[PDB]
């Protein structure tokens, strides 16, 4: 816990950082978070190799390793190693066979839709991961469905601690105070509220070809009685029940309070999600 890898070992296990997608015979799994993620192999383990303002990127790399060293939990991704050249930076993680929550909600690459039952477990798991971070006095600063990874049993794993500490983030998930420059765990709660709406609706947080463009704005439509939560429930499920959907929506609505001090803390969010099932 944890090794340094030679840049050449990682280059060799990712077929020379083969930028072609897995489907074509390459090693590229994705791109985001200032990098490209490649599928690699270390003896009995499939791994994810993330190949990464010059000095600011190195600070993000060092920060992530620091967070990983301190924060070990069932609902946080596990770092296996790192490389560091030179001007070549790699982070090696336990491979998550089910990718991100974002991609599973959109059924990317033809994966079947997540059941309401699975969605409830993922929401609980993600809240448990955030609770571990907040209990250990860390603010994530980039809570989003792309940063919630899914293992072999669809267990939620909080990812990307590159921005974490004691104006950056993703605009569609950011709390008003975060957009103004404030750093608070209360902003993580707001972002988790957007994730909960993505879980209920199966809709992305932002869509330029949609009315409203921002998913968080459906809260206003529902409050003003222009729409109902029933109207927005992801139709790609057969096992959703109005009671538990309304209970998850009530949590999301509380998380999305415009006034940071009126939002529940992560312990309250966990309690509410536990009561839901
Ligand atoms: C800072 C930081 N950065 C990245 C990680 C991290 N990232 C990924 C990851 O990132 C992506 C989502 C972008 C590709 N992907 C996967 N695995 C995967 C990817 N695609 N799939 C598919 C294969 C096709 N089928 C059809 C459906 C599932 C499985 N594991 C990961 C494991 C990690 F630790 C952690 N921390």
UniProtKB/Swiss-Prot annotation:
Its EC number is 2.7.11.1. GO terms for biological process: cytokine-mediated signaling pathway; innate immune response; interleukin-1-mediated signaling pathway; interleukin-33-mediated signaling pathway; intracellular signal transduction; JNK cascade; lipopolysaccharide-mediated signaling pathway; MyD88-dependent toll-like receptor signaling pathway. It catalyses: L-seryl-[protein] + ATP = O-phospho-L-seryl-[protein] + ADP + H(+); L-threonyl-[protein] + ATP = O-phospho-L-threonyl-[protein] + ADP + H(+). Keywords: Acetylation, ATP-binding, Cytoplasm, Disease variant, Immunity, Innate immunity, Kinase, Magnesium, Nucleotide-binding, Phosphoprotein, Serine/threonine-protein kinase, Transferase. The active site is at residue 142. ATP binds at residues 29-37, 50, 144-147, 160. One of its GO terms (cellular component) is plasma membrane. It comes from the Eukaryota. Residues 23-273 form the Protein kinase domain. It is found in: Cytoplasm. The keyword Nuclease does not apply. Phosphorylated. Its cofactor is Mg(2+). Serine/threonine-protein kinase that plays a critical role in initiating innate immune response against foreign pathogens. Involved in Toll-like receptor (TLR) and IL-1R signaling pathways. Is rapidly recruited by MYD88 to the receptor-signaling complex upon TLR activation to form the Myddosome together with IRAK2. Phosphorylates initially IRAK1, thus stimulating the kinase activity and intensive autophosphorylation of IRAK1. Phosphorylates E3 ubiquitin ligases Pellino proteins (PELI1, PELI2 and PELI3) to promote pellino-mediated polyubiquitination of IRAK1. It is linked to Immunodeficiency 67: An autosomal recessive primary immunodeficiency characterized by recurrent, life-threatening systemic and invasive bacterial infections beginning in infancy or early childhood. Belongs to the protein kinase superfamily. TKL Ser/Thr protein kinase family. Pelle subfamily. Associates with MYD88 and IRAK2 to form a ternary complex called the Myddosome. Once phosphorylated, IRAK4 dissociates from the receptor complex and then associates with the TNF receptor-associated factor 6 (TRAF6), IRAK1, and PELI1; this intermediate complex is required for subsequent NF-kappa-B activation. Direct binding of SMAD6 to PELI1 prevents complex formation and hence negatively regulates IL1R-TLR signaling and eventually NF-kappa-B-mediated gene expression. Interacts with IL1RL1. Interacts (when phosphorylated) with IRAK1. May interact (when phosphorylated) with IRAK3. This is Interleukin-1 receptor-associated kinase 4. The lineage of its organism: Eukaryota, Metazoa, Chordata, Craniata, Vertebrata.
